Amino acid sequence: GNSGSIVQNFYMQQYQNSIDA
Amino acid sequence: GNSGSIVQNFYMQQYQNSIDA
Amino acid sequence: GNSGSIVQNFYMQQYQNSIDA
Amino acid sequence: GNSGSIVQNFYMQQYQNSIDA
Amino acid sequence: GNSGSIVQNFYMQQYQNSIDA
Amino acid sequence: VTNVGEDGEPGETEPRHALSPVDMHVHTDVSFLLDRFFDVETLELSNLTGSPATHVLDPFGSTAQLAWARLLNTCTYFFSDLELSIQFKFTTTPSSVGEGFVWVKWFPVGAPTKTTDAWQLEGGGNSVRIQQLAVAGMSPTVVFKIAGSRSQACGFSVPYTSMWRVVPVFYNGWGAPTKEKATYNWLPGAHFGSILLTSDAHDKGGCYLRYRFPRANMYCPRPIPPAFTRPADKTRHKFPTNINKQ
Amino acid sequence: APIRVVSVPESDSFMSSVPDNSTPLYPKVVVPPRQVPGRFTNFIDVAKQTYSFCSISGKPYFEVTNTSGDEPLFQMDVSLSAAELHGTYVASLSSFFAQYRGSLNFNFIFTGAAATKAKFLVAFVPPHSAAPKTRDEAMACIHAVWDVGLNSAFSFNVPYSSPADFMAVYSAEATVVNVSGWLQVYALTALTSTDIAVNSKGRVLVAVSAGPDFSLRHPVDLPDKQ
Amino acid sequence: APIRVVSVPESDSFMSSVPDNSTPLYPKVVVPPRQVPGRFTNFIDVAKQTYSFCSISGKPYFEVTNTSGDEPLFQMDVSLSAAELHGTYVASLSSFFAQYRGSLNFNFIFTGAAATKAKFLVAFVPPHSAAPKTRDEAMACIHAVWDVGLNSAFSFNVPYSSPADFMAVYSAEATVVNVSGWLQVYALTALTSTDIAVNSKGRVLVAVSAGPDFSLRHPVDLPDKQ
Amino acid sequence: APIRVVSVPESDSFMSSVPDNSTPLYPKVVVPPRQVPGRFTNFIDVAKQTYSFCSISGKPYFEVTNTSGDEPLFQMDVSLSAAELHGTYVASLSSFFAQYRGSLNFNFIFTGAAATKAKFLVAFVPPHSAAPKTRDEAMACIHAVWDVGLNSAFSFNVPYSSPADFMAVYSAEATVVNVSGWLQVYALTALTSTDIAVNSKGRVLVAVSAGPDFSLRHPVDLPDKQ
Secondary structure, three states, X not given: OOOOXXXXXXXXXXXXXXXXX | OOOOEOOHHHEOOOOXXXXXX | XXXXXXXXHHEOOOOOOOOOO | OOOOEOOHHXXXXXXXXXXXX | OOOOXXXXXXXXXXXXXXXXX | OEOOOOOOOOOOOOOOOOOOOOOOOHHXXXXXXXXXXXXXXXXXXXXXXXXXXXXXOOOOOOOOXXXXXXXXXXXXXXXXXXXXXXXXXXXXXXXXXXXXXXXXXEEOOOOOOOOOEEEEEOOOOOOEEEEHHHOOOOOOEEEEEOOOOOOOOOOEEEOOOOOOOOEEOOOOOOOOOOOOOOOOOOOOOOOOOEEEOEEOOOOOOOOOOEEOOOOOEEEOOOOOOOOOOOOOXXXXXXXXXXXXXX | OOEEEOOOOOOOOOOOOOOOOOOOOOOOOEOOOOOOOOOOOOHHHHHHXXXXXXXXXXXXOEEEOOOOOOOEXXXXXXXXXXXXXXXXXXXXXXXXXXXEOOOEEEEEEEOOOOOEEOOOEEEEEOOOOOOOOOHHHHOOOEEEEOOOOOOOXXXXXXXXXXXXXXXXXXXXXXXXXXXXXXXXXXXXXOOEEOOOOOOOOEEEEEEXXXXXXXXXXXXXXOOOOO | OOEEEEEOOOOOOOOOOOOOOOEOOOOOOEOOOOOOOOEEOEHHHHHHOOOOEOOEEOEOOEEEOOOOOOOEEEEEEOOOOOOHHHOOHHHHHHOOOOEEOOOEEEEEEEOOOOOEXXXXXXXXXXXXXXXXXXXXXXXXXXXXXXXXXXOXXXXXXXXXXXXXXXXXXXXXXXXXXXXXXXXXXXXXXXXXXXXOOOOOOEEEEEEXXXXXXXXXXXXXXXXXXX | OOOOEEEOOOOOOOOOOOOOOOOOOOOOOEOOOOOOOOOOOOHHHHHHXXXXXXXXXXXXXXXXXXXXXXXXXXXXXOOOOOXXXXXXXXXXXXXXXXXXXXXXXXXXXXXXXXXXXXXXXEEEEOOOOOOOOXXXXXOOOEEEEOOOOOOOOOEEEEOOOOOOOOEEOXXXXXXXXXXXXXXXXXXXXXXXXXXXXXXXXXXXEEEEEOOOOOOEEOOOOOOOOO
16 A cells, blocks of 8 residues: 555564554 | 656655556 | 664664673 | 765766766 | 764765875 | 986986885875865845846856966866855845745856846735746756755756867967957856856845866866965975974 | 764755656556657657748748849858748757757758749858858859759758857857858859740748757756847 | 654754765766867876976076186075975975975076086085085085086986975974975086186076975965965 | 655754764875884773882882781772772773773882891781781781792782672772772781891882783763862
């Protein structure tokens, strides 16, 4: 979704968002 | 065209511009 | 711990923190 | 000449300067 | 010495400091 | 050594334990010494209204010997790009322009001129005009405020405009088929361009133009002008230095 | 942790030609295909593969009577804002700029009766004198002679010869860089007709094709309208 | 998402020697070739491969009469702002800077009648005493003797000897680093001519070539004009 | 196009120890070589390979008469700001910091007549009691006995024993971390001479070498002068 910049992962996806299982 | 900086693709070309086919 | 950004090591871990042995 | 920083080529040399032949 | 950041060499060592022989 | 002089070409002697180099000459390198924003010139901006005096970036004039002047007239022909950095020293109470936009517009060798009004910003009444050729478009404009701006300055690149394969400093001939007193050392556009400064200011401040001459190439050496009177024979000239005595 | 940076004094300023775009506020907008032919990438391109009538007197053509001879037929100061080269594509294109470096071509489309012959002469006068005013003066320069009758038009390439690598797309008081000279055409043989009665005059179109080495460099805003 | 940064206190300041350019507002400007010969990259270069007349008295040369002998002929405090070395290329170049580290060379172009002979002596006096004033005092130092007649000029290399790796391109009150000493030339044999009548005096040019180990370091703005 | 960043609140602040330099305003300055010997990288280094006289009474030495015996000879609270260890290199170095972790060494250079013998005792009293005041009390601790005559000096290593990994380079009111104890030397045998006449007293120098496991950590500004 609307996040097409190569800086979005400055904060790795754990801190960024959530996680399912 | 007048965009010769290596930061232009911070936003990948989908968000940047359009697309044809 | 709460530092999940890929800029935390701008200052290498010697200046950053301490060290044990 | 006096440009010893690794950011000088943010603008590629076409936009930066001129060109001869 | 007290410069443990990975940006110190933005200015290459010629502009940065001096040189001996 | 016995010199058979007169045929130009110098003549050396070479002692014993000749001395090792260091520094590598380097600090005398033409392109290098000239790649630094100098403080050259200084003008007065334009009111948005009325007709302008298109300023021209011709740094091949010299006179006030600020060691950049002589250096340019050490060569015959010169070819380099340019880069500028306008600043703007307030001249009175630095709180009388609550905004000051300044339409620094650069022009390339040959661009037309005649700039009367044609723009106008409509808003609730009053409406403030902008100079016709001042607006944005073909030739790079920069809009910077003169209020709260922690550096009422700008700055950019300006690649070599002029038609000439290289810029001749001192011309011996004339510039136009009208062998006229003026067109002697003129030559049509031995320069880097122009600049038109317009802002609601114009008064209450000046500027301090600047030049960064990257890719400076020099040709045909010339003699280098003394810059200091002659002293009293046999002796030294004494300028108060870092060193000195006390 | 936090990176260390320093803003240039310039910083929060405009820049009307920053080599680099802006922030993409709408995204993923796929765009439909285009099937229209007659497309272009370069502007020089169109003026090279296309002529345009030069405006002599208010018309795009001169005359040829059987009472001429000496007098000049057509003359103009070869600079992209000289009268004739005013209305042309090639010249009107130019004014978005500041410089050109090209030799031009002209084509002489003779339109007189099919019972008319005119024979003739063109000449390029490099800058020096003050406009030769008789072929006898002009023929001593670079010229071409042409005989209508079976041709049905002609072509002359006014070259590029000057010390400067680029000249001015804008004319001004006599400079070594404004003027490239004149272009002249002469009555090397006063026109002829089946009857001087039916056919009075013959005419000739003066079309301007961009030369094969011609190019415009440097875009520039438009001054005032004058 | 957004990067984390911190401006240095300095930040939005000038910097009149920032190793790095500015924003390229005009681009793609291809530039025409240059065919001019006699080009240079380095300034030392030109003063090494080129002499320049030192200004003794107001002229670039001393005399030689058949009434001299003891007296000194030429003397000057070897420092790049000492009288003689004032008008020279090598010395005038210097003032864009602050330091030099080189031994200099001088060439003595004797210009007297072709029926004249002068024979002679040069001498370098390192700093210590207060200027020897007779060769008998000076010859006890480093000196060279030369006989015009068939030579037609001569060369003497005033070396570099001092405890500091660089000296001052600017002269000032007596320092261990200003003065490198004196340069002296003497009448080791008073001049001679076919007739004292026709040929009174002989002369000699004093040309200054940059030495082979000489270099200027440190650019510096120009002070006041004095 | 434009990168997205966020300044930390701190941002445009100073920082008197930012691990990273500043903007290089002068460049390419090649620097001349250095041939001076006796150079150093580390400060501990110099105080390890070098002693310094401890200031007892106002002098760097105690006495030894043939009327002593019981009484203590030398005593001081082993902490880097205790009287004796005040003027020493090792102690004066310390005050640029805040912490030390080392056992010290002392050397006893006996200077009495070459016809004098003194024999003797040193003792380290860990912190607890309130200063034993007779060897009979002190000998029950860690001590060393030494006989001048042929030795010509002696060495005693006051170790490091305490629960804290680093102690205080600054003395203060009795803490478990200030005081490491006392250092004591005793007259285990009252001095002797060829004649009590010629040789009254013998002396002994008290030199302080940094121990082999000693180090200073933490630089700290200097307080007030007191």
